[PDB]
Write a protein that binds this ligand. Structure first.
Ligand SMILES: OC[C@H]1O[C@@H](O)[C@H](O)[C@@H](O)[C@@H]1O
Ligand SMILES: OC[C@H]1O[C@@H](O)[C@H](O)[C@@H](O)[C@@H]1O
Ligand code: NA
Lengths: 346, 339
């Protein structure tokens, strides 16, 4: 079933329920996921109205871009030309600059395919917006099916050579309560290397480091506390995790990550080369989610994209987008029950 | 009463009915007026869904900007520097450039004051959008009251020196049907001068002309057919009217224009210096409004703003907006019925 209602400020809330009774919801404000529940428990973090997003934190569950992450000094090189983008975090351009796409009302259309329902959100990024050459016609399609798979499909075409590498900023918290840390979750992630940050400004250091056998190695499932409790310089630097992990094997076919709590698991599939993991290292900020004060480590993202820093570390990729060339990216989060035995205590 | 409903593509339709039973409706798609009716008659032109506006004509009833009208070569000088805006009509920048603010979904909030209801739409134009320095936080409040007054108040603030001169693009048609020319309406206009167009590109000619005692003098009410049957080269050039008229006296308290058809009349008030009048000179286009084929001259605008062409004729005014300055503009359309 599909249901729609106003969500505030002129935005809408589109709620879907599949045949298994799982419900998921999105808003056109930032083409974003608002909630995902199983048996009345929230699987992700979200608010109850549009205004909260705008007043508390506008990133959660959003489509962010045109370029996800931080670009050192807002400087990109496009077809031999230097361009300075909006700098909204000191001299850095973070998540596309200020008042970016995650803050806009996108138009949308719903397509009912029976076992699958699609919500295609559209938006045009005008030429020059936040310094990006364009115009860029973008669309983000969120779909949910009878097999509990939530899929995000991005498409984009630009009138001019530009840069594009958006991502989805959902935060998971299988506790279903923001006030409960995710250190009790089990994590498996198919990555042998990571990208360290230079310092507190969070730009990339310039090197790629092997994490095998460190507290950041999750090739084999381990509890998140292992990382949170780590005194590794990088962990101490950000007070948790806030890094790109380079996937060892690429392809939409491989389960790249799996997050488990008790009998529930979320599997991550993507055609992108890296996953940026940020564990809500907000300290005592205490943003209220459904009236619960969020705790430090009260959430985790799996933002799949081309790793940030490719400006300095070309080995990471090329996010350029040629005029007329069709960009496409696909990320899938699938929900499972009793996938494995995970019975722990913290 | 206030009613909100889904207008298509995720946009909303907000309809306000006042104590007199008159109904006006807006959509956040473009902070625009969609309909205005009395005794089941439409007074303005509009479509029945969001898609129609995107497919047929995105201007009708919309908030257009940041700069309304045509800018020669898309060029403006800001702080002595030349800036090139998005060119969407040849080398000209018409109504803000392609995919401008009229095609965006704006956020909004409704405020019910009893005798009056206000709908405040807001949108942020990012720095560099379509070549315009910013960011510009903009808001347009459309309100409707029990006295049948529809008012539009604009406000804006920019982080950088820029240009700003928006307008409301409603088209009136007291016939209540697009297939009927407005040539039968009577128009009164408190303007003794107009801005001639250079040619078919519609950029300004460079001069200001006195229209006293010509087919375009509407200082005393007259039927539009007059102007329509004129042999003035300017009328002939565009096949109707498509020009900025310079108001004789500035100020919100003066009725600047008045459009009349039978017992029904619309009065225009504004704090702007000019009114741009365009008589839907679409020839055979035949755009469909409520299943009715539009006819050449099947509508007329009263776009209040600073006259286009100030880039070449500085006397027209100055559209700059300095960083930190708050821009404000107000335009009111008042509906009257003779008893
Ligand atoms: O929401 C704020 C957070 O956004 C994340 O996407 C970034 O990686 C964090 O460093 C930042 O503090
Ligand atoms: O909507 C299209 C029309 O917009 C008006 O504001 C212009 O003056 C006309 O020349 C143009 O054809
Ligand atoms: Na709505």
């Amino acid at each position: 079933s599909i249901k729609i209602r106003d969500f505030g400020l002129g935005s809408d809330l589109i709620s879907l329920t599949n045949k298994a009774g799982v419900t998921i919801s999105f808003t056109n404000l930032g083409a974003r996921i608002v909630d995902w529940q199983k048996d009345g428990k929230h699987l992700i973090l979200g608010f109850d109205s549009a205004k909260e997003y705008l007043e508390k934190d506008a990133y959660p569950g959003a489509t962010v871009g045109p370029t996800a992450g931080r670009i050192k000094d807002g400087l990109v090189k496009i077809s031999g030309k230097d361009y300075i983008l909006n700098q909204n975090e000191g001299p850095q351009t973070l998540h596309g600059g200020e008042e970016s796409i995650h803050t806009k009302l996108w138009t949308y259309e719903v397509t009912d395919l029976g076992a699958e329902v699609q919500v295609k959100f559209s938006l045009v990024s005008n030429d020059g917006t936040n310094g990006y050459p364009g115009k860029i016609e973008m669309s983000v399609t969120h779909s949910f099916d009878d097999d509990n798979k939530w899929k995000i499909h991005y498409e984009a075409i630009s009138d001019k050579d530009t840069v594009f590498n958006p991502t989805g900023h959902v935060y998971f918290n299988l506790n279903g309560d923001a006030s409960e840390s995710v250190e009790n979750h089990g994590l498996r992630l198919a990555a042998s290397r990571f990208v360290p940050l230079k310092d507190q400004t969070e730009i990339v250091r310039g090197d790629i480091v092997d994490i095998k056998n460190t507290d950041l190695d999750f090739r084999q499932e381990k509890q998140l506390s292992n990382a949170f409790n780590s005194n590794m310089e990088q962990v101490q630097l950000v007070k948790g995790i806030d890094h790109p992990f380079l996937l060892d094997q690429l392809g939409l076919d491989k389960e790249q990550a799996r997050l488990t709590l008790d009998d529930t698991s979320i599997s991550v599939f993507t055609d992108q080369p890296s996953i940026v993991i940020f564990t809500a290292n907000f300290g005592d900020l205490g943003t209220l989610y459904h009236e619960k004060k969020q705790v430090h480590h009260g959430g985790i993202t799996f933002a799949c994209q081309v790793s940030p820093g490719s400006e300095q570390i070309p080995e990471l990729g090329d996010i350029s987008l040629k005029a007329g060339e069709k960009y496409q990216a696909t990320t899938i989060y699938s929900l499972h029950t009793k996938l494995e035995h995970h019975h722990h205590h913290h």
